[PDB]
Amino acid sequence: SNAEKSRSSWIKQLNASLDEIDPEVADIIELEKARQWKGFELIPSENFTSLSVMQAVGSVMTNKYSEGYPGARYYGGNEYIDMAETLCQKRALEAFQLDPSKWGVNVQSLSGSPANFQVYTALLKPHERIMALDLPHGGHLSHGYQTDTKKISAVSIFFETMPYRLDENTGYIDYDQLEKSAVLFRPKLIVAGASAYARLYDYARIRKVCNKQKAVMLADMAHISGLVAAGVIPSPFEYADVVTTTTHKSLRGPRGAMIFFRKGLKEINKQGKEVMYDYEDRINQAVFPGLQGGPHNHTITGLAVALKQARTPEYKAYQDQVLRNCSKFAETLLAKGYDLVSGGTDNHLVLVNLKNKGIDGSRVEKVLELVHIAANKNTVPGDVSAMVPGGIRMGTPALTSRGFIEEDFAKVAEYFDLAVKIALKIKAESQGTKLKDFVATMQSNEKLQSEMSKLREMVEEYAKQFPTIGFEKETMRYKE
Amino acid sequence: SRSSWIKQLNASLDEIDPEVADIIELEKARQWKGFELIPSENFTSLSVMQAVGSVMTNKYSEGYPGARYYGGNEYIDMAETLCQKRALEAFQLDPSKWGVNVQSLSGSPANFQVYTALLKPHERIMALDLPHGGHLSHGYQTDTKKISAVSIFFETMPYRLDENTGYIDYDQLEKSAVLFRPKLIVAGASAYARLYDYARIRKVCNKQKAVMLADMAHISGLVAAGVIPSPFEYADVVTTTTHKSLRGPRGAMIFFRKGLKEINKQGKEVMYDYEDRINQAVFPGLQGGPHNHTITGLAVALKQARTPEYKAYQDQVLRNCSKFAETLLAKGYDLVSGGTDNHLVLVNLKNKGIDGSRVEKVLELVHIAANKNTVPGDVSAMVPGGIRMGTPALTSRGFIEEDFAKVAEYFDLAVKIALKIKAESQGTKLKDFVATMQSNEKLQSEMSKLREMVEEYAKQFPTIGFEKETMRYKE
Amino acid sequence: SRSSWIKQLNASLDEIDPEVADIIELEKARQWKGFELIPSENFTSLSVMQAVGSVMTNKYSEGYPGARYYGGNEYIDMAETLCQKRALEAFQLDPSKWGVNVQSLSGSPANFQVYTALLKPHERIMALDLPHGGHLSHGYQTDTKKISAVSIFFETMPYRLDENTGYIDYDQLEKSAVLFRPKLIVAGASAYARLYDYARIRKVCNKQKAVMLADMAHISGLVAAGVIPSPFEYADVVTTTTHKSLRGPRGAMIFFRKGLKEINKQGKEVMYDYEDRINQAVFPGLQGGPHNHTITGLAVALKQARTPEYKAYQDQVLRNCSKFAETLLAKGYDLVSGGTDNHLVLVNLKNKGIDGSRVEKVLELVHIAANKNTVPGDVSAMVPGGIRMGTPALTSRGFIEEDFAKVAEYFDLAVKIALKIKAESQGTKLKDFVATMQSNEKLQSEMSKLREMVEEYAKQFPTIGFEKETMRYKE
Amino acid sequence: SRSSWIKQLNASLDEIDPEVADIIELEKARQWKGFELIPSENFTSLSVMQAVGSVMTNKYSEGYPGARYYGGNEYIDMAETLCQKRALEAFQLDPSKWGVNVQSLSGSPANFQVYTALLKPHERIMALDLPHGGHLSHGYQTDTKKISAVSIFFETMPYRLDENTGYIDYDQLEKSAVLFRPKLIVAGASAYARLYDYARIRKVCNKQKAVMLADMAHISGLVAAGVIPSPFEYADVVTTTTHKSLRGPRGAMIFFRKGLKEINKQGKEVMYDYEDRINQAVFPGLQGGPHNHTITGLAVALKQARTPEYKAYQDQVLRNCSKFAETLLAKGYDLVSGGTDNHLVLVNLKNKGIDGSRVEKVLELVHIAANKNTVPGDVSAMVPGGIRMGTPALTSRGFIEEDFAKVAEYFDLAVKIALKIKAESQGTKLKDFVATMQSNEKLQSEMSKLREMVEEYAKQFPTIGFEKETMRYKE
Ligand SMILES: Nc1nc(=O)c2c(CCc3ccc(C(=O)N[C@@H](CCC(=O)O)C(=O)O)cc3)c[nH]c2[nH]1
Ligand SMILES: Nc1nc(=O)c2c(CCc3ccc(C(=O)N[C@@H](CCC(=O)O)C(=O)O)cc3)c[nH]c2[nH]1
Ligand SMILES: Cc1ncc(COP(=O)(O)O)c(CN[C@@H](CO)C(=O)O)c1O
Ligand SMILES: Cc1ncc(COP(=O)(O)O)c(CN[C@@H](CO)C(=O)O)c1O
Ligand SMILES: Cc1ncc(COP(=O)(O)O)c(CN[C@@H](CO)C(=O)O)c1O
Ligand SMILES: *Cc1c(COP(=O)(O)O)cnc(C)c1O
């Protein structure tokens, strides 16, 4: 009686819906759905995943252990997991128009940050040297980072890192100083990859420095991979030895990562011997058995779906719109008196340098957040500290996914400008000059609270008009 | 164009990607019709999968609840904080003595994050030897190559079984540790059929002033249900995956002591110093944005782990494995350590005159999913002498003791077929075995008959996480 | 002003620096009047000292003979080439099978240079534990601190004595090495009274594919004379100091196999790969200009090592130590391993109720130079329980067997005084012992009488390296 | 057989080892007859050599004065304590602000001991690039190989000269240090002809919180005499050899700040933390028994460094080098940095159309001892484009300004012969140059004539450390 009652009970538990089993979690998800419906989402690393990707990520593919590689597994039962991973690899090469005799791919790395660590582990001995764009100048923690205080990224613990920096007069990477630094530092690997950079890489110049230094050229295209797949910006694959990327962000896939690497002939050396690329086995073995265990086959299957979408004409039109929206956004910001780092943009984001407006990014970000415009404060050339940012970073991928077009991003720039004006009013009313005096005014001044409520209402009414991505408005729990 | 990509983003998987949809339908049928005996596998709940497949995936939330780098994380914070508090409750932990990190992406990086938090590069780790039931994420090197990157960045040395008994040789562990001076000792295994002597590991770690890390990935659901002894009584740090016996999404958790540790010889309080180091190793040290969809599904799985029916499930996992072991022993099989006290068994096939690679090939063809596995005494990790099997996944579908007696019977029938294939093989090589297995009409018929028996038995049990009635492949 | 600084450059030490001249005269008297029993000390020849005190000191000669980075080295090349030739001849080595580096400045950096040549940073070394008779330059760390920098830059693990027998526990060494996987194993000691089983070390090194380094510093002169078995029969690399039983200047040599490997060890390379790596680690890796005054003095010492007189000397060293041990045993002293096969003994004072620190303080006051020394069983390495003594230095002055029986008698009388100071000591601590030792007039008189007995006995023997007749201090 | 080996031990070098005695006599004659221009060479005093060749060599004295690990060291303690006292006095150092270690065996291990004391393995060091005049013990690696072991165990990066001016580019050093974050910066060189901007290095070290290490090996005697500015005004740690301009024995010293460094923001004293770390790195970290004969000779040399005659000598060293540089420039040679402010010059032969290897071969044959040396602009490290020369050694023999004008003339005549050999060489490889140099009778006659000119000039000056009248080889 009790034994069978219990067995029926745990089977019911396993087959019941989330709404029935865990209403508290279901409610949180419904609140997050409403949040994604109502906001101006300008964080340039964020996007809205398709329903079909989410259905694959939420499938029974999660149940399987499949250590190894297709057709070379350690466990049985992997006939269909092998189909998915093989299909994912094939679509990954196709999405970037790569010759499979010249390029291989690993689709098992769990996210962007460990993907880079796996490349370093594959190709570098402990304490060998890496150069990458300095984090406050637009780099990423997974390329290394250390302050005067301590090593922040563990890449800087296990490997020896050194940054390269912007030309702070132009806002572009200072390639001349990168080259001169590399002569002295002797990197074994140079990363060409940025997060908060409004320009595209001079991959040809990085390639020249890497050739002279006999360094691996790693392109980390996480922020731009969807633009690359659509063919609307130049491809790092024209030059790089290894290419890493997140599968989320501009690719618009599940949370995950890919590692691409050259295969085949590198050069015939001076003795007439072929030198072959030595990346495939080293990288595949660093991922497994080196640093990961069982692949996440639900994510790999969702990635295959995302990579199919990436080849379509609709996806190319989407990425074209991302760029055109960002240019219109930049146009409108310039017309309204804002300064852009490097003077403009060539991609999906802008960096606004707020110095000429007489207020910093931390104050503006707080007002934007209260009116449901998501952006983030950003270091700009000229800041005295990497902890007091003078700028704001904003981008177009997420709202473009919901159907914002050029005229809509002109409106986004208008509402951003209205938020900046409120921030300046709060600063003017602030009894003091420190950020705590600013937030005290921002939370007690009823007149300025009312202006922010009004602007928040304007933001939400504009955003709500657009389709929701990945779920239906009609079945949302929270329709106000 | 605008309407064009909106439609693409909101279309079903069936509409957008029929090839992937069909692969998932084939995998559903595989999970329905087979004996899934890999002891690290389970069938997770529909509710977990609905959370993992939700829009929680869209948000970037680097940092920790209430201490994020980006805004817009109010509801992500609700989920992660709920997950953390449910994690401590699932193991009946006092939150003033234990903290938890729920962001680690899987079991292997979770262990690497602990080492990065607490050890400098090239500091010393001891753990169970991989061929004796350990795990790659604790270190492993051969005579010629460092296989796990743990053994590249840290200095590793194994401890071993008593090959006479199949239990860990704690006496030799203690003696080795005196000479090797580990800074951290791992108590955890992938292919060990017995309970750990955590008290003995604690004694060695105290003497060596080493961190005691319990890696409970395989047994975490048994621990949560309170049906085997808990490593939290003894350990400094506990890692676990969330997808094995815990029956959650693919992910991991890191638990650590916090608060007051002891009073020194001078009357001063000494506090634990794990929490900040581990949290910072996970982020910003080694990971970026948390996978909020997985964390949300983990919260769901942790609520399930508190229920009476979940405890009944884990008690059944244990009783099923005991019955499974008893039946295998009665049929003449040798088990490493002679039996089991948990969810798995390790069959040593050497006394039957055949190896694990050959038997596993037959199992695969009759729809029994297991893994060939090294046994103590194997001279090459490429020629495994054993098969590893366990009860979590089929117990989730409702297999009870008499059903696992049947599983042992069908395993034995598969071994008998493998022995016939070996006897008929025109050579001694694995490729000769495979050629016979694929060309011999009589033995192909026997395998087809056993496959039909396995599928007919498995099909009668409920499907977990999807509806049998709507499956594409119902035949 | 220029003729005067040239006068100061050519004047004698007596005229230029009477304070230093007086210090040397006091040290000459100390060497004349004492029982010098530290087994690593000797009295080198006048001819060695005249070469070390020559204008060979003025030359920079980085590189190797005939391959220098500076001009002017025609005669420095003759000296280094002659030194190398005599080094190989001193140990009866085939120059087609053995090479030598004579530039290493002393024993400790010589070993570090071998590790740097053959091991990557953090690779693994095994050697005899320091408290069991090993040496710091083979690695050493305590529970809390890495003491030798060898243990900072490389990963070290000790092997130990069998505490019951006092001999190296080779069985435990072999079992430990299986788990630890050393890349290099050191066979050599500072306070081991028995002969090494070099054949057994070779067997373990072969199984582990580890370099066998013999550090023969203490026994090199015995080896050169052929009176004990040679480590060159087995080792890959042999290091030594030149100032202990070899009786040369302060310095070191590194010997290494070269040429074709044994038939069963030839592979991708058929030749040994030690010579270039070791020579390059010495220079340009870790040293600069060779000390050609020392190298020239070493050439002199190596020629002396070939003579029948030198062989007779080393024979007497062994017979003196055997007699010394027998006399100590008959006077009730416990010896580690119960005796000796070489030039030293290690007295364990446990059966006497007093430690090495107390006894050595009395020895020093009665002009007997020895060292307190850890013994097996000591609970702490700061409180050594033994005294180490040996025969090389006094044998050089002509002490024979009956003279070392007298040395043992006077050692015994010193221990008895130490026991009286302990018995009269109020407190239990070493400060109270020293307080008694410096304030008790009766025991101060007994130490004075014993000091006179030691000095009267030692003064009868020839001085080595200088003449009694020109000593400043003749009383 | 006692009487036989005791006579062996007390006989003179002439009696025991005529071959070695002969080599030393040949080297004496070479030091009499040649132009010794290697700027790291000197001629030390007889009194130093008598101390280095004394019975102080016989003592083991591990530890520090008054803190030895065993007995017999009463007089060795006097010598080391006296040497420390004189070391601080020679550089006018306040003993409450500076300490010193006098046990480091030579300059290269002294620097390695400082790194081991103050830096963990793989921490970062900046120093002057070897091809720009730096030293191997500050680090050196090529694209293919780590040459100095400093670059194996630590992470090194060079700073460079302004190749237009030949002075250190301090602006680039500072900018490089921002990016590289060195933990230690070396201010010292082997072939830099200008004075260091120690104040600028101090400012960079302060901004980077890096240790400022001055390696003053080449200039130490100039510093002691007060004829150039002192690195002790700025540096945290100062290393030096003792055998170059200091004019002492072959050895080294490590100086370090001690005592109060600063008061922190809470009013608490902050002490320097160099002394214990450095002393413990020397022993027990990296060395064993001190070389007390060298330490005793060093004490002698340090007393000699205090005299007015010594100051007059170091002033003459500078004036001689200035005139030497002026004469080389007048004869058409290019100097790196266009001149000198210290004891050496570096000739860049590019404008003469010949490399340093060819020129040094002729110098050697005409008894001018110098070294081929890399210069800025050299494409290959193995094809040095320069010749390094300096004045300490011949100034010690009484050369004055007009004499170094003649040295420059004879160097010029040797270069002219080298150019003739090159012109007569049919091939362009160095072996063809050597073949021409050894077979051309006319050019051999010219080298023989120039050799006779060099010897006739050099022989007129006093010999340092020995008397001409007792030279075995006067012809
Ligand atoms: N118990 C157990 N756990 C496992 O995880 C496992 C695996 C998968 C992980 C694994 C992979 C490669 C090697 C490996 O050894 N690779 C070598 C092969 C050659 C050699 O073994 O010397 C290599 O050089 O790659 C060892 C282990 C195989 N057999 C296993 N058994
Ligand atoms: N056999 C033998 N060989 C030796 O060379 C030796 C020595 C001299 C070298 C030495 C110096 C310090 C420590 C040392 O350990 N220092 C510790 C303090 C002691 C401890 O912690 O146990 C430190 O912290 O410095 C250990 C060894 C003392 N006793 C010895 N015995
Ligand atoms: C103790 C332990 N710790 C960590 C892990 C790694 O988890 P991951 O596969 O999610 O990285 C495992 C996985 N173990 C799997 C894969 O080998 C198994 O089949 O046993 C484990 O057993
Ligand atoms: C085996 C061995 N190898 C190396 C050394 C180091 O020689 P060094 O003192 O010249 O550095 C020693 C010194 N041994 C001295 C100091 O401890 C002794 O009294 O025993 C040694 O015994
Ligand atoms: C600045 C500096 N520091 C250290 C050293 C090393 O001294 P050592 O040769 O005694 O090891 C040198 C040696 N310099 C010698 C050998 O290169 C020379 O001819 O210049 C040095 O120039
Ligand atoms: C976001 C990003 C990453 C890291 O991805 P995560 O999934 O957050 O670990 C790595 N590189 C770049 C350039 C990125 O923008």
Residue numbers in the entry:
A (entry chain D): 38 to 517
B (entry chain C), C (entry chain B), D (entry chain A): 43 to 517
Sentences from the study reporting this entry:
Soaking crystals of AtSHMT2 with PTX and serine revealed two distinct forms, resembling situation observed for AtSHMT2-MTX complex. External PLP-Ser aldimine state (EA-type) is seen in chains B and C (PTX was not placed in chain A as suggested by poor Polder map coefficients). Internal aldimine + free serine state (IA-type) is present in chain D. In the EA-type of binding (Chain B), a direct H-bond binds exocyclic N2 of PTX to backbone O of Leu172. Water-mediated interactions involve each of the five heteroatoms in the P-moiety. Importantly, there is no π-stacking interaction involving PTX. Hydrophobic environment is ensured mostly by side chains of Leu172, Leu178, and Ile189 adjacent to PTX B-moiety. The carboxyl group (at Cα) forms a salt bridge with Nζ of Lys187.
Serine hydroxymethyltransferase (SHMT) reversibly interconverts serine and tetrahydrofolate (THF) into glycine and 5,10-methylene-THF (5,10-meTHF).
